[PDB]
Design a protein around this ligand. Structure first.
Ligand SMILES: CC(C)c1nc(CN(C)C(=O)N[C@H](C(=O)N[C@@H](Cc2ccccc2)C[C@H](O)[C@H](Cc2ccccc2)NC(=O)OCc2cncs2)C(C)C)cs1
Ligand code: HEM
Length: 457
């Protein structure tokens, strides 16, 4: 296996027996991707254990695997460990299975359904400002992840299940406590390092009922979803939950739970993380924060409530969101398994190979971005906008397998940002880590929580 890239004429770091190039992930795989792009150029290959991983950076080639040949050859993501029943979760499912889950869940975020959620989200936006104002009162340092996380949990559960768990008023909320423990992918943990280097273990762990997701956490989610499912079949809004309930009358019970777990995690974890990164960038760039507040005041004079339409009018807010996602992409890498031998744009790719798009590296690539390490919202303005390649910058992925919650995530975060900024200003304090350093974990997260001071306007 370790002689594949050598044989095909593809550059790459020399692999070690059994480990492949996995030890290079000691200072984060993003740095590894950066160094490989600089050292080897437009394409290179490395090995995760025995698994060949081909990294591509050419726009047209990226478009070919993410869009053109999605259903035909690059249909699924890389298997990543024992998943138990979560094998049915849409993001983990493959081929035809994934195809039906996709069409089934697709109606969830139509433009019409998104608009209906605005007032629902607003209730939580109001509680968010209230909680933050308390922090502004005491003047104590604020851990963004907690407050923004509770807001995110409340929003995803209400809009998806029509149930208000009121996380914004219950700090030890079991939903957040459990969800934040759902997946702690860490290469320093022997379990995750082992299954990544030796995939043959996966089948064995599945028999043993050993899962990457803690049994205690999934049990909790399973019970929680059942409860909410009941409250709906017993009471006298077509939402995520309804869509799945309707299918049952070919979706099985655990299967419905599997999708629910994906939505809860994405709505809570992924959303609150990006909000934290955005507020960090705003606190360390007062001119950007000041300028953003002015746009909001101009569009919504005297703290007027935001609306679906006015959210879309805010050009700078959108430039700020996009720029933060460029520097801190939750998708540090995008991947597709090559499920059959094929050539694309002049390059041959053997079956079984994992094709990887080093997003984090491409976003900081000194060919497409001047001053790549700088937070400059202007690069996304109408003027410079069209000069950004649609396949170099894909924070939500692209093609048939892209983020199904993209429009909801952008709308929800923007609603939060608006309410918060039309009431407060965030400033860095003593507990604020600057520069901000990312953890080496599998998911996009800073090493120490982002802490900031909130001041009332
Ligand atoms: C060595 C290798 C295995 C590793 N790769 C990475 C980066 N890459 C490329 C990944 O595909 N990492 C994977 C991942 O994020 N997979 C994903 C889609 C994706 C791809 C790239 C960037 C962001 C989202 C999806 C995985 O099926 C998971 C599994 C899961 C279920 C419940 C709670 C947490 C996780 N599904 C979700 O996390 O959906 C949540 C979300 C929805 N939108 C953004 S995240 C895994 C490790 C789970 C980190 S470690
Ligand atoms: C700012 C927040 C978010 C970001 C940055 C984001 C980003 C991504 C990315 C990069 C992928 C991988 C796509 C690919 O491989 O091409 C993904 C997949 C997915 N996301 Fe998100 N996401 C976010 C929020 C959400 C939310 C809130 C939901 C749902 C409510 C959601 C549901 C999904 C699903 C189900 C998938 C898998 C799609 C499939 O396999 O068909 N995401 N997301």
């Amino acid at each position: 296996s370790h002689g594949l890239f050598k044989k095909l004429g593809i550059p790459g770091p020399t692999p070690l027996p059994f480990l492949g190039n996995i030890l290079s992930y000691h200072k984060g795989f993003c740095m590894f991707d950066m160094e490989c792009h600089k050292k080897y150029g437009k394409v290179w290959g490395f090995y995760d254990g025995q698994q060949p991983v081909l990294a591509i950076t050419d726009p047209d080639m990226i478009k070919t695997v993410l869009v053109k040949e999605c259903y035909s050859v690059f249909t699924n993501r890389r298997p990543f460990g024992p998943v138990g029943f979560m094998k049915s979760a849409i993001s983990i499912a493959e081929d035809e299975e994934w195809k039906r889950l996709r069409s089934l869940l697709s109606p969830t975020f139509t433009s019409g359904k998104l608009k209906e959620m605005v007032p629902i989200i607003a209730q939580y936006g109001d509680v968010l400002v209230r909680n933050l104002r308390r922090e502004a009162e005491t003047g104590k340092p604020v851990t963004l992840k907690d407050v923004f996380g509770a807001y995110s949990m409340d929003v995803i559960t209400s809009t998806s299940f029509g149930v208000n768990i009121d996380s914004l008023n219950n700090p030890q909320d079991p939903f957040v406590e459990n969800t934040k423990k759902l997946l702690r992918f860490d290469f320093l943990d022997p379990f995750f390092l082992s299954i990544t280097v030796f995939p043959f273990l996966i089948p064995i762990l599945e028999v043993l009922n050993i899962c990457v997701f803690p049994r205690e956490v999934t049990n909790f989610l399973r019970k929680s979803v059942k409860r909410m499912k009941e409250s709906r079949l017993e009471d006298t809004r077509v939402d995520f939950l309804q869509l799945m309930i309707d299918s049952q009358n070919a979706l099985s019970d655990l299967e419905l739970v599997a999708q629910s777990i994906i939505f809860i995690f994405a709505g809570y974890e992924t959303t609150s993380s990006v909000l934290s990164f955005i507020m960090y960038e705003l606190a360390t760039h007062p001119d950007v924060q000041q300028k953003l507040q002015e746009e909001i005041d101009a569009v919504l004079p005297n703290k007027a409530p935001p609306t679906y339409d006015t959210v879309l009018q805010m050009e700078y807010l959108d430039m700020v969101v996009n720029e933060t996602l460029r520097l801190f992409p939750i998708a540090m890498r995008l991947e597709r398994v090559c499920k059959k031998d094929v050539e694309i744009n002049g390059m041959f790719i053997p079956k079984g190979v994992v094709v990887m798009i080093p997003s984090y590296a491409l976003h900081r690539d000194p060919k497409y971005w001047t001053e790549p390490e700088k937070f400059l919202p202007e690069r996304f303005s109408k003027k410079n906008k069209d000069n950004i390649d649609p396949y170099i910058y894909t924070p939500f992925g692209s093609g048939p397998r892209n983020c199904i919650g993209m429009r909801f995530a952008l709308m929800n975060m923007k609603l939060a940002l608006i309410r918060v900024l039309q009431n407060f200003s965030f400033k860095p304090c003593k507990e604020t880590q600057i520069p901000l350093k990312l953890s080496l974990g599998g998911l996009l997260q800073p090493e120490k929580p982002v802490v900031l001071k909130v001041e009332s306007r």
